[PDB]
Design a protein around this ligand. Structure first.
Ligand SMILES: O=c1ccn([C@@H]2O[C@H](COP(=O)(O)OP(=O)(O)O)[C@@H](O)[C@H]2O)c(=O)[nH]1
Ligand SMILES: CC(=O)N[C@@H]1[C@@H](O)[C@H](O)[C@@H](CO)O[C@H]1O
Ligand SMILES: [Ca+2]
Ligand SMILES: [Mn+2]
Lengths: 123, 271
């Protein structure tokens, strides 16, 4: 499903301010990371990144390619391809707590300035 | 005897649909003034806009048909002295949009002394003819309001889809990069290059710039480029070593159709 900025901002409300990252920054990050597509599947190198947050099966979630992957998030990668973002968010938090915002390659180059544009002015 | 600042032929909002199949023969019949190779020059006045329209391409013939169907009458209404160039990427390596656009610049200039270049994806059709396909004081971003993004700019730094740079503005940034293979990033790098040269971005408003995109599937061999985020972070340096100055390519064939010129080139493989 291809969500909208506002739909995303609302959905990930609970991650706001975590690790010092605002919703504006996330809205920016997620657009560039997966274009707000909850079913995005990309093959970064030898691994695959899943969903809206593009969580990789290299270490974070468990897929068929990486059977003995760390699966640090303790979840099947397929659960990151639905429209229930609560488990994608929880996994994002663990990544923020362990690796930090830099896991999201788009953050530094595309979301270091002009963040106000990413604000959802919807009630 | 020089064309008016604003064309008197403009109609404004247009109905853009992609359901009726197109027949280039009809399009040609409907566009008598267009000469071999997709060239046109108004007969009344003299146009100061010598425009070469470059379209990066590989296996998008159906889209090209619609593009030609809609753009030709529009470009004439805009009173431009233009030429249509479809830069076809031979082979099956990862698609390189920016390099192909560079080739179009070079190749086009051999045919005529264009002073303006409009770089356009094959699937974007403007919805208002007031959205002139020409150059301005500053680099012009044309597809500012795509349906794909709710008729709004996806992000203020966006310079993708359809944009134009005068010959001076283009040489100014050493053209575009050639090192971006696969989808994503190249357009942001180009945007970065404009900034690192005091140049800003000109744009029509969100209504005059509404644009329709022919929906399609992700083409084979155009998967997101893994290193696109690292690359856009070092544009200030790489732009000096990656551009027109370093462009190399082998033209395999030049085709002149009545509505456009298709140049098939071998642009090598990713380094
Ligand atoms: O296999 C391909 C990939 C891309 N393109 C051209 O490159 C543009 C940009 O590609 P795409 O539409 O896939 O990019 P997106 O806008 O959807 O990111 C297209 O409009 C085409 O003009 C093409 O002709 N063949
Ligand atoms: C670094 C990157 O991926 N930038 C892309 C850009 O190439 C693309 O034109 C635009 C619209 O789809 O979305 C951005 O996220
Ligand atoms: Ca989920
Ligand atoms: Mn497209």
């Amino acid at each position: 499903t291809e969500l909208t900025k506002c739909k995303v901002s609302h959905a990930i409300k609970d991650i706001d301010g975590y690790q010092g990252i605002s919703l504006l920054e996330w809205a920016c990050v997620l657009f560039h990371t997966s274009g707000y597509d909850t079913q995005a599947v990309v093959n970064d190198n030898g691994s695959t990144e899943y969903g809206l947050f593009q969580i990789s099966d290299r270490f974070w979630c468990k897929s068929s390619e990486f059977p003995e992957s760390e699966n640090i998030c303790g979840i099947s990668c397929d659960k990151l391809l639905d429209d229930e973002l609560d488990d994608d968010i929880a996994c994002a938090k663990k990544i923020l707590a362990i690796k930090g915002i830099d896991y999201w390659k788009a953050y530094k180059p595309m979301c270091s300035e002009k963040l106000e544009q990413w604000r959802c002015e919807k009630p | 005897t020089a064309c008016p600042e604003e064309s008197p032929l403009l109609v404004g909002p247009m109905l853009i649909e992609f359901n009726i199949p197109v027949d280039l023969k009809l399009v040609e019949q409907q566009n008598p003034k267009v000469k071999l190779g997709g060239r046109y020059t108004p007969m009344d006045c003299i146009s100061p806009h010598k425009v070469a329209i470059i379209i990066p391409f590989r296996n998008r013939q159906e889209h090209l048909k619609y593009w030609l169907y809609y753009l030709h009458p529009i470009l004439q209404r805009q009173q431009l002295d233009y030429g249509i160039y479809v830069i076809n990427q031979a082979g099956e390596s990862m698609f390189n949009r920016a390099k192909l656009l560079n080739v179009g610049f070079k190749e086009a200039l051999k045919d005529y002394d264009y002073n303006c270049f409009v770089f356009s994806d094959v699937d974007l059709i403007p919805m208002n003819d007031h959205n002139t396909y020409r150059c301005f004081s500053q680099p012009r971003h044309i597809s500012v309001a795509m349906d794909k993004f709710g008729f709004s700019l996806p992000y203020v730094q966006y310079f993708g889809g359809v944009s134009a740079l005068s010959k001076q503005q283009f040489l100014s940034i050493n053209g575009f990069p050639n090192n971006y293979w696969g989808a994503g990033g190249e357009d942001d790098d180009i945007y970065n290059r404009l900034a690192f040269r005091g140049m800003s971005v000109s744009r029509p408003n969100a209504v005059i710039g509404k644009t329709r995109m022919i929906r399609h599937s992700r083409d084979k061999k155009n998967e997101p480029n893994p290193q696109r985020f690292d690359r856009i972070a070092h544009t200030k340096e790489t732009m000096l070593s990656d551009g027109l100055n370093s462009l190399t390519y082998m033209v395999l064939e030049v085709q002149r159709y009545p509505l456009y010129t298709k140049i098939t080139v071998d642009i090598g493989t990713p380094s």
